[PDB]
């Protein structure tokens, strides 16, 4: 009753029919089947990051010409959980779906290579671990970049250091417009939780 303050923490509860963990199994067994637990499992599913990427013919294009753009939006699960965390380790699987009006007077093919991060086009070589597909017989390019880093983990959008882990270079022959989808590899995981930034809603843009 005296003049002062205490803390006396009270976890007082409302409705207390049954244990919560028991009803959640019974609720998902009749409504879902699938039981989503860990967000590490959502970095294994290939969500499409773009719908159209019109690549100019005969140019060794790094994916960082698209990754700097498409890590802002958070459309996929890699860049939407780029805001709840700070570090990451693990390689990024990429799949490329061809959507080109192909022409019979050419033999279309697709290459792929490695560059370290954030280098430009001409300042890297080409003999490395490669992969090749032929989109007449195989429209999907099934490529996984490994995790070849100097450091054990990487923060997002670092300082003036560059070329400290590896990523993809994408070479074609014809002006192939595609779909690009991605997720992390088997050992891709974030860490070091922070609080989340904001969200953006609908932009109907009424006149007055």
């Amino acid at each position: 009753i005296n003049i002062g303050n205490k803390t006396n923490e009270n976890v007082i509860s409302f409705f207390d029919s049954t244990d919560a963990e028991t009803q959640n199994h019974n609720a998902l067994m009749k409504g879902c089947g699938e039981f989503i637990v860990n967000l590490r499992t959502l970095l294994r599913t290939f969500r499409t990051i773009t719908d159209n990427w019109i690549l100019q013919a005969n140019t060794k294009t790094p994916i960082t010409d698209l990754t700097n753009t498409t890590d802002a939006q958070g459309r996929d699960y890699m860049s939407y959980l780029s805001y709840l965390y700070r570090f990451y380790r693990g390689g990024r699987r990429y799949k490329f779906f061809n959507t080109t009006p192909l022409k019979q007077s050419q033999t279309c093919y697709i290459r792929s290579f490695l560059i370290p991060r954030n280098y430009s086009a001409d300042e890297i070589n080409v003999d490395g671990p490669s992969h090749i597909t032929y989109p007449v017989i195989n429209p999907v390019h099934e490529v996984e970049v490994p995790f070849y880093s100097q450091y054990r983990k990487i923060p997002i959008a670092s300082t003036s250091d560059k070329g400290y882990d590896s990523s993809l270079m994408y070479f074609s022959n014809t002006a192939t417009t595609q779909i690009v989808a991605r997720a992390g590899n088997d050992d891709f995981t974030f860490g070091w939780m922070i609080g989340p930034p904001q969200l953006q809603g609908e932009s109907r843009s009424v006149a007055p």
Binding site: Y77, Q198, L199, S203
Partner: protein, 50 residues
């Protein structure tokens, strides 16, 4: 919260900006939810307020 900019002399754009609790921020990914909520209401008082 609504952000109102200008485009022309008689047209504007009203973009909805939402706050995001980490419980809220995960739920935007998923469609249907079921969760036991929690709230910790704290009074910031002096020694003399009753």
């Amino acid at each position: 919260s609504i952000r109102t900019t200008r485009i022309s002399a008689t047209e504007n754009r009203e973009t909805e900006v939402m706050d995001a609790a980490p419980c809220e921020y995960v739920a935007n990914m998923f469609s249907y939810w079921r969760a036991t909520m929690c709230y910790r209401i704290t009074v910031v008082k002096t020694a003399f307020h009753t």
